[PDB]
Amino acid sequence: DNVPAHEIVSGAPAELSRNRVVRIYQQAKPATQSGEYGTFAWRLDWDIVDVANRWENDLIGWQSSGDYMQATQMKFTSKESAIKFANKQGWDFYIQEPHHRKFRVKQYANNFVHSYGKLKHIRTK
Amino acid sequence: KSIISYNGNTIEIPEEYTKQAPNRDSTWAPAQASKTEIYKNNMVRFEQKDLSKQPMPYAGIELIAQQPVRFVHGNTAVCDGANHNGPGAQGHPKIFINVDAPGSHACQYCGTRYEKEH
Amino acid sequence: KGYSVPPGETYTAIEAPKGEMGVYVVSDGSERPYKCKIRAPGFAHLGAFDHIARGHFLPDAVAIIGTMDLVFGEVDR
Amino acid sequence: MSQVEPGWHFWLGYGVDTAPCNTPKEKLPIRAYPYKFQPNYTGTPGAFVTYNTLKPKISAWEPVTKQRS
Amino acid sequence: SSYPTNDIAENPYWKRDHRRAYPQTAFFDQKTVTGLLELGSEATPRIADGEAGTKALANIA
Amino acid sequence: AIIATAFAETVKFSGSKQELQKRTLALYRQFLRGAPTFADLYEVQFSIPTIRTKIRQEFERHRFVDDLSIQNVLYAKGHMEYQECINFWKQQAQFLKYFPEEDDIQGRHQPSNFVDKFLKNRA
Amino acid sequence: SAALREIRFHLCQNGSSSAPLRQFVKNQIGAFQKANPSTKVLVREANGVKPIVFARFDHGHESKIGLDVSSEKEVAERVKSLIEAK
Amino acid sequence: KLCEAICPALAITIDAEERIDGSRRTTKYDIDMTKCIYCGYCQESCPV
Amino acid sequence: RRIMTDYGFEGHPLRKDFPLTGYTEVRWDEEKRRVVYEPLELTQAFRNFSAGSTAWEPVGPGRDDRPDSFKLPTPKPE
Amino acid sequence: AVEKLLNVEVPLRGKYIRTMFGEITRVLNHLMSVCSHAMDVGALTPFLWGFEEREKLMEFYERVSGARLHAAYVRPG
Amino acid sequence: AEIELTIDGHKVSIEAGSALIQACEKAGVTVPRYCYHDKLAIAGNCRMCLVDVERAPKPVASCAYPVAPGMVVRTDTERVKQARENVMEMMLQNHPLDCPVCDQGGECDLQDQSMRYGRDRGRFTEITGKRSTEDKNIGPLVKTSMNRCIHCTRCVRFANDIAGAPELGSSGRGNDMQIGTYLEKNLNTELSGNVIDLCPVGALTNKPYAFRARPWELKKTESIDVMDAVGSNIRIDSKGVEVMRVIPRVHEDVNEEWINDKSRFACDGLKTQRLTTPLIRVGDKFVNATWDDALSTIAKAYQQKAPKGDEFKAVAGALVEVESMVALKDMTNALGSENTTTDTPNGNSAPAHGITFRSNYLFNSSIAGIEDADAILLVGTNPRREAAVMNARIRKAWLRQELEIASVGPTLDATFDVAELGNTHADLEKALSGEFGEVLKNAKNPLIIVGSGITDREDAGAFFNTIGKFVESTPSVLNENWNGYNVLQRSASRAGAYDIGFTPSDEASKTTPKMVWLLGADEVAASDIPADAFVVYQGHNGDVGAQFADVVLPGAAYTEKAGTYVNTEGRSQISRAATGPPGGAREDWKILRAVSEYLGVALPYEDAYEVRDRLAEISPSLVRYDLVEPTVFGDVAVQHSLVGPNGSVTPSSAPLTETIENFYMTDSISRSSPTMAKSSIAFNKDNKKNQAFA
Numbered sequence A: 001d002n003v004p005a006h007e008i009v010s011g012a013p014a015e016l017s018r019n020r021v022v023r024i025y026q027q028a029k030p031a032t033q034s035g036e037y038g039t040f041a042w043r044l045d046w047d048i049v050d051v052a053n054r055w056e057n058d059l060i061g062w063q064s065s066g067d068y069m070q071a072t073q074m075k076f077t078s079k080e081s082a083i084k085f086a087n088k089q090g091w092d093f094y095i096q097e098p099h100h101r102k103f104r105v106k107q108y109a110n111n112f113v114h115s116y117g118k119l120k121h122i123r124t125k
Numbered sequence B: 001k002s003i004i005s006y007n008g009n010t011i012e013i014p015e016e017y018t019k020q021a022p023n024r025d026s027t028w029a030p031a032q033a034s035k036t037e038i039y040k041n042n043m044v045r046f047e048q049k050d051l052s053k054q055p056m057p058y059a060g061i062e063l064i065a066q067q068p069v070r071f072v073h074g075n076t077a078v079c080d081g082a083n084h085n086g087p088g089a090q091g092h093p094k095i096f097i098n099v100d101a102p103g104s105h106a107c108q109y110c111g112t113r114y115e116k117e118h
Numbered sequence C: 001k002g003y004s005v006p007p008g009e010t011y012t013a014i015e016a017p018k019g020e021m022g023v024y025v026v027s028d029g030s031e032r033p034y035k036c037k038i039r040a041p042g043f044a045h046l047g048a049f050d051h052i053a054r055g056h057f058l059p060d061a062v063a064i065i066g067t068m069d070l071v072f073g074e075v076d077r
Numbered sequence D: 001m002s003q004v005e006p007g008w009h010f011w012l013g014y015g016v017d018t019a020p021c022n023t024p025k026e027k028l029p030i031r032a033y034p035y036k037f038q039p040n041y042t043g044t045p046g047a048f049v050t051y052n053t054l055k056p057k058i059s060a061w062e063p064v065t066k067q068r069s
Numbered sequence E: 001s002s003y004p005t006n007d008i009a010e011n012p013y014w015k016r017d018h019r020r021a022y023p024q025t026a027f028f029d030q031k032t033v034t035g036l037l038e039l040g041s042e043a044t045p046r047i048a049d050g051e052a053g054t055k056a057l058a059n060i061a
Numbered sequence F: 001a002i003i004a005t006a007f008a009e010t011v012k013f014s015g016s017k018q019e020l021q022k023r024t025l026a027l028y029r030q031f032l033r034g035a036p037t038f039a040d041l042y043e044v045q046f047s048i049p050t051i052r053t054k055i056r057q058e059f060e061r062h063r064f065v066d067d068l069s070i071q072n073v074l075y076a077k078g079h080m081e082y083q084e085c086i087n088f089w090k091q092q093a094q095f096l097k098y099f100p101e102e103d104d105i106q107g108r109h110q111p112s113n114f115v116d117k118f119l120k121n122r123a
Numbered sequence G: 001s002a003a004l005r006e007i008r009f010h011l012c013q014n015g016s017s018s019a020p021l022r023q024f025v026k027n028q029i030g031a032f033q034k035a036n037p038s039t040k041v042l043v044r045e046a047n048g049v050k051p052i053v054f055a056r057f058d059h060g061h062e063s064k065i066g067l068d069v070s071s072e073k074e075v076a077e078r079v080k081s082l083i084e085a086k
Numbered sequence H: 001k002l003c004e005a006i007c008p009a010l011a012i013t014i015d016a017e018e019r020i021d022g023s024r025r026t027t028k029y030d031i032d033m034t035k036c037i038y039c040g041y042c043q044e045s046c047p048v
Numbered sequence I: 001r002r003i004m005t006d007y008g009f010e011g012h013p014l015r016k017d018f019p020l021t022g023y024t025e026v027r028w029d030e031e032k033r034r035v036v037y038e039p040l041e042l043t044q045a046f047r048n049f050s051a052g053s054t055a056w057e058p059v060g061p062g063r064d065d066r067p068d069s070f071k072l073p074t075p076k077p078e
Numbered sequence J: 001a002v003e004k005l006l007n008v009e010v011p012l013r014g015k016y017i018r019t020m021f022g023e024i025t026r027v028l029n030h031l032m033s034v035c036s037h038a039m040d041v042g043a044l045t046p047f048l049w050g051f052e053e054r055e056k057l058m059e060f061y062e063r064v065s066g067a068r069l070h071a072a073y074v075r076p077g
Numbered sequence K: 001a002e003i004e005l006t007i008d009g010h011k012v013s014i015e016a017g018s019a020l021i022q023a024c025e026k027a028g029v030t031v032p033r034y035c036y037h038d039k040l041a042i043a044g045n046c047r048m049c050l051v052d053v054e055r056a057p058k059p060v061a062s063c064a065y066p067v068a069p070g071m072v073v074r075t076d077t078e079r080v081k082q083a084r085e086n087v088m089e090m091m092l093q094n095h096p097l098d099c100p101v102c103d104q105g106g107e108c109d110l111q112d113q114s115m116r117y118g119r120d121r122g123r124f125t126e127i128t129g130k131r132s133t134e135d136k137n138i139g140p141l142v143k144t145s146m147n148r149c150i151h152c153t154r155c156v157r158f159a160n161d162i163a164g165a166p167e168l169g170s171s172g173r174g175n176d177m178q179i180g181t182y183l184e185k186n187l188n189t190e191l192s193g194n195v196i197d198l199c200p201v202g203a204l205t206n207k208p209y210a211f212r213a214r215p216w217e218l219k220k221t222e223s224i225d226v227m228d229a230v231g232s233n234i235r236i237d238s239k240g241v242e243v244m245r246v247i248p249r250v251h252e253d254v255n256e257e258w259i260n261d262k263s264r265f266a267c268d269g270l271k272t273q274r275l276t277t278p279l280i281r282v283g284d285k286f287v288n289a290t291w292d293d294a295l296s297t298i299a300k301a302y303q304q305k306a307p308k309g310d311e312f313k314a315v316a317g318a319l320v321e322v323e324s325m326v327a328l329k330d331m332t333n334a335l336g337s338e339n340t341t342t343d344t345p346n347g348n349s350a351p352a353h354g355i356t357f358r359s360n361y362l363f364n365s366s367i368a369g370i371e372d373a374d375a376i377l378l379v380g381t382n383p384r385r386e387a388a389v390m391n392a393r394i395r396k397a398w399l400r401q402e403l404e405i406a407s408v409g410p411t412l413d414a415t416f417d418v419a420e421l422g423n424t425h426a427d428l429e430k431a432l433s434g435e436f437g438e439v440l441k442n443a444k445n446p447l448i449i450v451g452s453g454i455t456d457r458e459d460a461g462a463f464f465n466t467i468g469k470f471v472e473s474t475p476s477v478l479n480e481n482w483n484g485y486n487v488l489q490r491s492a493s494r495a496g497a498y499d500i501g502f503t504p505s506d507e508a509s510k511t512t513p514k515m516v517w518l519l520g521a522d523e524v525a526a527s528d529i530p531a532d533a534f535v536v537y538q539g540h541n542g543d544v545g546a547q548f549a550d551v552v553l554p555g556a557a558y559t560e561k562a563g564t565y566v567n568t569e570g571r572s573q574i575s576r577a578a579t580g581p582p583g584g585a586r587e588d589w590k591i592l593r594a595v596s597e598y599l600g601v602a603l604p605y606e607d608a609y610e611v612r613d614r615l616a617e618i619s620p621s622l623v624r625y626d627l628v629e630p631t632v633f634g635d636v637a638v639q640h641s642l643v644g645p646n647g648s649v650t651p652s653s654a655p656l657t658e659t660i661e662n663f664y665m666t667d668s669i670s671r672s673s674p675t676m677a678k679s680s681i682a683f684n685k686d687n688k689k690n691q692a693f694a
């Protein structure tokens, strides 16, 4: 084993180590855009605790919170660094393996191929 | 108006202050809270206060329906809410509205309407 | 979003009236900095204050802090 | 000083050389609504009360019952 | 405004893009410095031609 | 030269557990001898024995830590706190952070089984 | 323990420990289901798991033993013991 | 919601929806003047 | 010893695991008559807005400015 | 710092303005500094003879920025 | 065969006939695009992908130039930079200054690629001004502002190739080109909203999200789509406690970039007609109550009524986790009851196909297997209404391959040619033994898709017996390389239920229950539940089952619980919590542990990790997240479950009926959504807008 417990010298609470879950992941490729720069980094974000995530204030309508890790998102270069840092701090983690687009050939010619039988569909462009 | 509190009591408020604005009673958006639900939820902080002096600005949804329609010759109307009186832009970005369709069409920034001469 | 600064890092400095002020910025290709340390001349001044005041009486300690005219919002960063 | 109407609060302050009384017409803002000047009523009942213009985001269900016919 | 940047015709941005022309952060470990020593540099070469000199670089890499 | 303050120890990372044992024991001894000063300087509303009990608890917290570097870090942090306390740098609040127990019972329902946590949405 | 009411088999698909239980399942399942006509017989597979059986008699009392044996017959007798030792 | 994004102090709080006349408008616009630093980035971003 | 942070502060702030707001806050307890440290609870939560970060690479690779005396020589092709 | 990272060049008029306001600022700092040293040493008067000069120089601030002290005039680029 | 080439000096290998842009993607070189989407056909209208190839004099289109051995490609030299700046100048000539009111601000490709590959300032100041265009009215779900179109033709290609909605086309010519239906129509397809994710510009925008929020404000969470048994991965976007929208996520073995309209527009049902407090019935009224009071009321009902054995019924509906059904099952049994049961019509009795082997009630040949299909059969299923995404996959395979399809069911208005051939068991045996039987034998990768409405019939055994006899009889469907028997479920709970048991025993199937704990169930009929029984609904929305209930206990929706959900393939997926459940609502398994303790029993687990170790003790594939597993017991499974105990059922003459009479308004979340109400009033066949006179 022999992975140091820096959780003891971190000065942070122990509730993060004993009750709180994280998730390690890559941001999914957005469908609203076609870029892929926001990916390639392994984020680490805490999972919610229900009672203290958000609740609406009576006075003016602002959203409150008691969870202090609702906005912290560490960024890592690789999965192994994330897992090591988590274990060194004693956090329990679930790994979310990414889902990559599967390569398939694409030709402009397939739009204009011969149909020996009934046209399946009529192309526009 | 007499508004029933949650705790079974009543909340008396005069009619001039229950209107959503001095020119309109109803709400102009689904998520808007009506003044009655406001009072009913917040009378602890309205109790000894004077409602005449609280801010009650006019609504724009009713002051812009009053503005006459404008007309143009063509399938385009250009809008730029520019003052024309002082320097600078002072308005909103140029927007070309299509007006071929039978009805009026309003700019998305300001609600000024345009029509195809008919 | 703001503008994307190139990756890198730099300490650049000036002749601020207090002294040699400086900023140590780091970049990661994002619109948000990764680190920014303000080097504050009043910091080193107050740090030397112990070396400078030894042997002197209290009115002179007042005059010493006045020579440096530390602005403690800087000193505390 | 809250009793000072706008325009004057700017002339009184050397923001302009021309007063609202003599400023020309085109320089005056047009108003589709009436004017109504109200000072800082702080410390008095007419102090501004804040509130939420919205209603609760999560609307609950108003019960109604059925019978097991 | 200034003239060559307000010019409307022969004023491409890719010539006055000084941000994407930023100078790289060079890095030199002892390996990359001994090659400059045992071999030389593009200004003062001391390297053998052909795949021989290629593997000579490789011996230091 | 910028000279060290009163009870300052130079940071020195021991290479062995057998020396750090001695240094930790001296720290514990100093805390105990100085506890009455921690009761006088800070206007305290309880016993010197209760302070010594809390000190023993804080040293039992990390009693089962076998990694040497972490122990050196813990010892340095503890000497920092002794210097903070014995010199009157801390005020009452920062000291009674270590004594939540002495303050009055916070309410009635302090859940310890499931069902109460569920009724309070803490499970 | 008034009755058996559910049986769950867990096993690998292709590991070494599970093959005798794979044979038991392929060959004896209908006879098991007729000799116990009132029970949910459940087979559920997953690569890398250690073959094992669970039974549920009444009021949720569940029993369990592994089936890392080297024969189909050891499986039969071991299953039957767990079904009897209610 | 550019004023809500550039504001250093995050004082502003907005919530919009489609108005009855089919336009884009606000139902909530708040400012905490106890969070405001009076920078003027909000009068700079607004394109109207 | 610490110089900036509070005398009893437990944590190291500029670490990337340390949340912006910290873990604690202070109020005056009329009962105890003491400034007392309690767990954090904010009336408006932190909104990051770093989720609007660009999906396209903003500034491509730079431009070499190594002097040629420090460039690893290219062997002559033959 | 941020221009050095972005690798852009400031225009000349902006350089001269940043200079002029840098020196107006050094005046505004040396005034407060010297004339607080005085007051801590007991001479109350040079303080109030200088702060008026500071208050004439802050009109230039409110004219260019809008704010009297904390301003934000100089920005990257 | 893989070739090799050069790109900005780097060397890469990809198959022949491929697009250069795919190679560039392989080599990491970032290239712009508007007209190119991976899942769509190619075109070359945007002209932003231009690059320099030494073979050709002009810059060429990466989106369309075939890749060839030894070709060298630069994407950095001054010609490319100029050509990109010029194209973007041209694109933004006639683009309106609508960015503040455009819902794509902060997530528009045009902004980013103009800032990155384009000019700081424009030279279009002309006084005649920009082109204009009118907005179309293609239905409630899609809002239009067509001055913003760049004529990428993603919308057209999607509609006509992946969806089957050819009402969307390219009218006009030249600068007066106008994408639209030439006359007022509606974009009638259940995949209509994916168009919104395809348009780069905000010319097609979601309507119930229209202006509510901006992307930088949103907490993106990666979760799972209930509303179908497919388990389509998604990305939720919350604004604190509120859930603004849903958008798809990538998974090539399940959903492959698409999601249906129900899953994208049912979010509006998670903020209205919710349950926030417990309720008790005292007469005709409900009365708000505490948790202590309702659970104690449940206990007094148990002790007063004294249900014995199988009188305690448990009903789990659609939109349930697997942790909840486990906890309900362990509790039910701990009270001495085996009457666990689905909310299906014939849920009272055990399924015809048997839960014994996973292979009998799952889509065995995985959803990535339809691409390899040659012949298909549809028995009592309308995939366009049960898992539309897999109808899209069938069409994608039907176009580019040799595929011949048949159906035995109600005539279904499909997005493909189907060759309907009956509506009865009699025509089913006829086809399977006549012609299409021979087509399935002589196929290499055949599929026999059975709907779950067959399982929801009284004569289900007569079917599953015949299909099992044919499957075992025909090797081509069942081998050591291919299982062509498939059951398509229409809800996300049934597979997890069957994986943990949750089937009624025949002993309990005949008892008339005394207490009725119904979980997420809103499809009940008022006949399945007696009058004199005590009833306890758990849900997050009050639509049907609450109205019956004497006691109502809030639960949480899919956005507020990290539940495990199992899909048709048997793939286990884990959800994520986006928000906390509202008000006095609680996670279900906690509620059942607490009421269990209040009753004369308990469950042996307290927190998450213990519930997970339990799930493993029930079935170890419930904690192999995202892994789909093969199975070795196919032959045995069809011999033991489908063929054996189903010979005694006789087939009816009742013709098959469509399982889902309305794709909208299927479950509680959706019935509570007004958007599904507007969308079920329109998008009806009887409306003129939804039928083209061909």
Ligand code: SF4
Residues within 6 Å of the ligand: H003, H006, H007, H008, H009, H010, H011, H012, H031, H035, H036, H037, H038, H039, H040, H041, H042, H043
């Ligand atoms: S000027 Fe004031 S309100 Fe506007 S962003 Fe700055 S601090 Fe906020």
Ligand code: SF4
Residues within 6 Å of the ligand: H001, H002, H003, H004, H014, H045, H046, H047, H048
């Ligand atoms: S229009 Fe102006 S005030 Fe309104 S949200 Fe935009 S920037 Fe803020």
Ligand code: SF4
Residues within 6 Å of the ligand: K148, K149, K150, K151, K152, K153, K154, K155, K156, K179, K198, K199, K200, K201, K203, K204
């Ligand atoms: S309508 Fe939208 S999706 Fe279709 S081509 Fe135009 S911009 Fe693209």
Ligand code: SF4
Residues within 6 Å of the ligand: K095, K096, K097, K098, K099, K102, K103, K104, K105, K106, K108, K109, K110, K111, K148, K200, K201, K202, K203
């Ligand atoms: S589509 Fe993009 S560029 Fe066009 S108005 Fe919308 S945000 Fe702006």
Ligand code: FES
Residues within 6 Å of the ligand: K032, K033, K034, K035, K036, K043, K044, K045, K046, K047, K048, K049, K050, K061, K062, K063, K064
């Ligand atoms: S991406 Fe090639 S021209 Fe459109």
Ligand SMILES: [Zn+2]
Residues within 6 Å of the ligand: B079, B080, B081, B092, B095, B107, B108, B109, B110, B111, B112
């Ligand atoms: Zn306008």
